[PDB]
């Protein structure tokens, strides 16, 4: 209700803050690498537009979830 809802919002937001180290790091490294394999075959390819979409959508999982979730983690526990 009061403290239990603040423990739940905190724990999900810090779990979300670490999630980009799997998600958006596979976005840049593996779906930028697989993008450049697509550009060597055909520079306007359908799996090129999939992999380039996951370059932006990956590294934006990084920016949004790291700043909102590290913000909430430090507000509840450190204060």
Swiss-Prot record:
The keyword Endoplasmic reticulum does not apply. It is found in: Cell inner membrane. SUPFAM superfamilies: F1F0 ATP synthase subunit C. One of its GO terms (cellular component) is plasma membrane. PROSITE patterns: ATPASE_C. Coiled coil: none annotated. One of its GO terms (biological process) is proton motive force-driven ATP synthesis. Disulfide bonds: none annotated. It is a multi-pass membrane protein. Residues 1-10, 74-79 are periplasmic. F(1)F(0) ATP synthase produces ATP from ADP in the presence of a proton or sodium gradient. F-type ATPases consist of two structural domains, F(1) containing the extramembraneous catalytic core and F(0) containing the membrane proton channel, linked together by a central stalk and a peripheral stalk. During catalysis, ATP synthesis in the catalytic domain of F(1) is coupled via a rotary mechanism of the central stalk subunits to proton translocation. Key component of the F(0) channel; it plays a direct role in translocation across the membrane. A homomeric c-ring of 10 subunits forms the central stalk rotor element with the F(1) delta and epsilon subunits. This is ATP synthase subunit c. It comes from Escherichia coli (strain K12). The lineage of its organism: Bacteria, Pseudomonadati, Pseudomonadota, Gammaproteobacteria, Enterobacterales.
């Amino acid at each position: 209700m009061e403290n239990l809802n603040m423990d739940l919002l905190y724990m999900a937001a810090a779990v979300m803050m670490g999630l980009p180290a799997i998600g958006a790091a596979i976005g840049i490294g593996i779906l930028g690498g697989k993008f450049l394999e697509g550009a060597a075959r055909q520079p306007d390819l359908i799996p090129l537009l999939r992999t380039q979409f996951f370059i932006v959508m990956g590294l934006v999982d990084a920016i949004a979830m790291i700043a909102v979730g590290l913000g909430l983690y430090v507000m509840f526990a450190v204060a």
